[PDB]
Design a protein around this ligand. Structure first.
Ligand SMILES: *[C@@H]1O[C@H](CO)[C@@H](O)[C@H](O)[C@H]1NC(C)=O
Lengths: 108, 50
Protein backbone atom coordinates (compact mmCIF):
# COMPACT_ATOMS: atom_id res chain seq x y z
CA UNK A 1 0.00 0.00 0.00
CA UNK A 2 1.70 3.19 -1.32
CA UNK A 3 -0.91 6.00 -1.55
CA UNK A 4 -4.43 7.34 -2.24
CA UNK A 5 -6.42 9.40 -4.81
CA UNK A 6 -9.35 11.76 -3.93
CA UNK A 7 -11.86 13.90 -5.95
CA UNK A 8 -15.23 13.48 -7.76
CA UNK A 9 -14.45 11.98 -11.25
CA UNK A 10 -10.86 11.24 -9.96
CA UNK A 11 -9.60 11.51 -13.61
CA UNK A 12 -9.65 14.23 -16.39
CA UNK A 13 -12.72 16.48 -15.77
CA UNK A 14 -11.80 18.00 -12.33
CA UNK A 15 -8.91 18.56 -9.93
CA UNK A 16 -8.07 15.48 -7.82
CA UNK A 17 -5.54 14.79 -5.04
CA UNK A 18 -2.69 12.31 -5.32
CA UNK A 19 -0.86 11.07 -2.17
CA UNK A 20 2.20 8.75 -2.74
CA UNK A 21 4.74 7.26 -0.27
CA UNK A 22 7.93 5.68 -1.77
CA UNK A 23 9.87 5.04 1.54
CA UNK A 24 12.41 7.81 0.55
CA UNK A 25 9.68 10.54 0.69
CA UNK A 26 5.95 11.33 0.73
CA UNK A 27 4.89 13.23 -2.45
CA UNK A 28 1.53 15.09 -2.52
CA UNK A 29 0.03 16.84 -5.59
CA UNK A 30 -3.27 18.23 -7.02
CA UNK A 31 -4.03 18.13 -10.79
CA UNK A 32 -6.66 17.29 -13.47
CA UNK A 33 -4.90 13.87 -13.39
CA UNK A 34 -4.77 10.89 -15.77
CA UNK A 35 -1.98 9.22 -13.71
CA UNK A 36 -0.85 5.59 -13.15
CA UNK A 37 -3.18 3.30 -11.11
CA UNK A 38 -0.32 1.04 -9.81
CA UNK A 39 2.90 2.61 -8.30
CA UNK A 40 4.40 -0.95 -7.97
CA UNK A 41 5.66 -0.22 -11.56
CA UNK A 42 8.54 1.76 -9.88
CA UNK A 43 10.25 -1.41 -8.41
CA UNK A 44 -3.00 20.65 -13.43
CA UNK A 45 -0.17 21.83 -11.09
CA UNK A 46 -2.67 23.54 -8.67
CA UNK A 47 -0.73 22.45 -5.50
CA UNK A 48 2.36 20.32 -4.63
CA UNK A 49 4.04 19.24 -1.32
CA UNK A 50 6.86 16.79 -0.29
CA UNK A 51 8.36 15.37 2.98
CA UNK A 52 1.20 -7.67 8.82
CA UNK A 53 2.70 -6.72 12.26
CA UNK A 54 2.58 -2.91 11.78
CA UNK A 55 -0.94 -1.54 12.19
CA UNK A 56 -0.87 1.82 10.35
CA UNK A 57 -3.94 4.00 11.09
CA UNK A 58 -5.05 7.23 9.39
CA UNK A 59 -7.94 9.71 9.38
CA UNK A 60 -8.67 11.96 6.38
CA UNK A 61 -11.20 14.88 6.56
CA UNK A 62 -11.83 17.95 4.34
CA UNK A 63 -13.11 21.12 6.14
CA UNK A 64 -13.27 24.79 4.92
CA UNK A 65 -10.82 24.05 2.03
CA UNK A 66 -8.23 22.23 4.27
CA UNK A 67 -7.55 18.46 3.94
CA UNK A 68 -6.51 17.15 7.42
CA UNK A 69 -4.47 13.96 7.86
CA UNK A 70 -3.94 12.26 11.27
CA UNK A 71 -2.02 9.00 11.89
CA UNK A 72 -0.70 6.35 14.29
CA UNK A 73 1.67 3.37 13.97
CA UNK A 74 1.61 0.44 16.44
CA UNK A 75 2.95 -3.15 16.36
CA UNK A 76 0.18 -5.78 16.94
CA UNK A 77 0.55 -9.41 18.15
CA UNK A 78 -2.71 -10.89 16.75
CA UNK A 79 -2.56 -9.91 13.01
CA UNK A 80 -6.08 -11.45 12.38
CA UNK A 81 -8.01 -8.10 12.33
CA UNK A 82 -8.33 -4.64 14.07
CA UNK A 83 -7.17 -5.42 17.67
CA UNK A 84 -9.40 -4.58 20.65
CA UNK A 85 -7.98 -1.71 22.78
CA UNK A 86 -7.38 2.08 22.55
CA UNK A 87 -4.73 4.41 20.98
CA UNK A 88 -5.18 7.98 19.67
CA UNK A 89 -4.06 9.30 16.24
CA UNK A 90 -1.72 12.33 16.34
CA UNK A 91 -1.95 15.04 13.59
CA UNK A 92 0.36 14.88 10.51
CA UNK A 93 -0.51 17.53 7.88
CA UNK A 94 -3.27 20.00 6.87
CA UNK A 95 -3.26 20.69 3.09
CA UNK A 96 -4.66 24.17 1.97
CA UNK A 97 -6.10 22.77 -1.31
CA UNK A 98 -9.84 23.80 -1.64
CA UNK A 99 -11.11 20.72 -3.66
CA UNK A 100 -14.62 19.12 -3.71
CA UNK A 101 -14.11 15.41 -2.72
CA UNK A 102 -16.96 12.82 -3.01
CA UNK A 103 -14.86 9.67 -3.85
CA UNK A 104 -11.46 8.12 -3.08
CA UNK A 105 -9.30 5.08 -4.02
CA UNK A 106 -6.20 3.29 -2.56
CA UNK A 107 -2.91 2.66 -4.47
CA UNK A 108 -1.16 -0.75 -4.20
CA UNK B 1 -10.78 45.38 -23.75
CA UNK B 2 -8.69 43.01 -21.62
CA UNK B 3 -10.48 39.60 -21.76
CA UNK B 4 -7.71 37.76 -19.76
CA UNK B 5 -9.84 38.19 -16.56
CA UNK B 6 -12.92 35.93 -16.25
CA UNK B 7 -15.65 35.16 -13.73
CA UNK B 8 -17.99 32.13 -13.60
CA UNK B 9 -21.59 33.28 -14.24
CA UNK B 10 -23.16 29.79 -13.66
CA UNK B 11 -22.62 26.72 -11.40
CA UNK B 12 -24.90 23.74 -10.45
CA UNK B 13 -24.36 24.55 -6.70
CA UNK B 14 -22.84 27.32 -4.51
CA UNK B 15 -19.16 27.02 -3.43
CA UNK B 16 -18.35 26.07 0.21
CA UNK B 17 -15.80 28.23 2.16
CA UNK B 18 -12.50 28.36 0.16
CA UNK B 19 -13.85 25.83 -2.41
CA UNK B 20 -12.09 26.15 -5.85
CA UNK B 21 -13.47 24.81 -9.17
CA UNK B 22 -11.93 25.72 -12.60
CA UNK B 23 -13.63 22.98 -14.73
CA UNK B 24 -15.46 24.66 -17.69
CA UNK B 25 -18.24 22.02 -18.15
CA UNK B 26 -21.46 23.36 -19.80
CA UNK B 27 -24.28 24.52 -17.47
CA UNK B 28 -27.80 23.37 -18.52
CA UNK B 29 -30.97 25.31 -17.51
CA UNK B 30 -33.33 23.99 -20.28
CA UNK B 31 -34.13 20.35 -21.29
CA UNK B 32 -31.36 20.74 -23.97
CA UNK B 33 -29.05 17.72 -24.78
CA UNK B 34 -26.03 20.08 -24.98
CA UNK B 35 -23.17 17.47 -24.78
CA UNK B 36 -20.37 20.12 -24.44
CA UNK B 37 -21.50 23.18 -26.53
CA UNK B 38 -23.62 26.39 -26.03
CA UNK B 39 -27.36 26.21 -26.95
CA UNK B 40 -31.01 26.86 -25.94
CA UNK B 41 -30.79 27.77 -22.20
CA UNK B 42 -27.38 26.00 -22.16
CA UNK B 43 -24.28 27.96 -21.29
CA UNK B 44 -20.50 28.12 -21.29
CA UNK B 45 -19.92 28.85 -17.56
CA UNK B 46 -17.27 31.66 -17.79
CA UNK B 47 -17.72 35.32 -18.87
CA UNK B 48 -15.29 38.31 -19.03
CA UNK B 49 -15.22 42.00 -18.01
CA UNK B 50 -13.19 43.04 -21.12
C1 LIG C 1 -19.27 18.14 -5.30
O1 LIG C 1 -19.36 17.53 -6.63
C2 LIG C 1 -20.54 16.65 -6.88
C3 LIG C 1 -20.56 16.26 -8.37
O2 LIG C 1 -19.40 15.47 -8.70
C4 LIG C 1 -21.83 17.39 -6.51
O3 LIG C 1 -22.93 16.45 -6.48
C5 LIG C 1 -21.77 18.05 -5.13
O4 LIG C 1 -23.02 18.78 -4.94
C6 LIG C 1 -20.54 18.98 -5.03
N1 LIG C 1 -20.50 19.62 -3.72
C7 LIG C 1 -21.19 20.73 -3.43
C8 LIG C 1 -21.07 21.28 -2.00
O5 LIG C 1 -21.93 21.24 -4.27
Amino acid sequence: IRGWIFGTTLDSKTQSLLIVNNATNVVIKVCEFQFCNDPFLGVNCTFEYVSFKNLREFVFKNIDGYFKIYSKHTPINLVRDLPQGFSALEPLVDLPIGINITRFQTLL
Amino acid sequence: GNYNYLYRLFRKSNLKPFERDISTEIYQAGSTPCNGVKGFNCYFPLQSYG
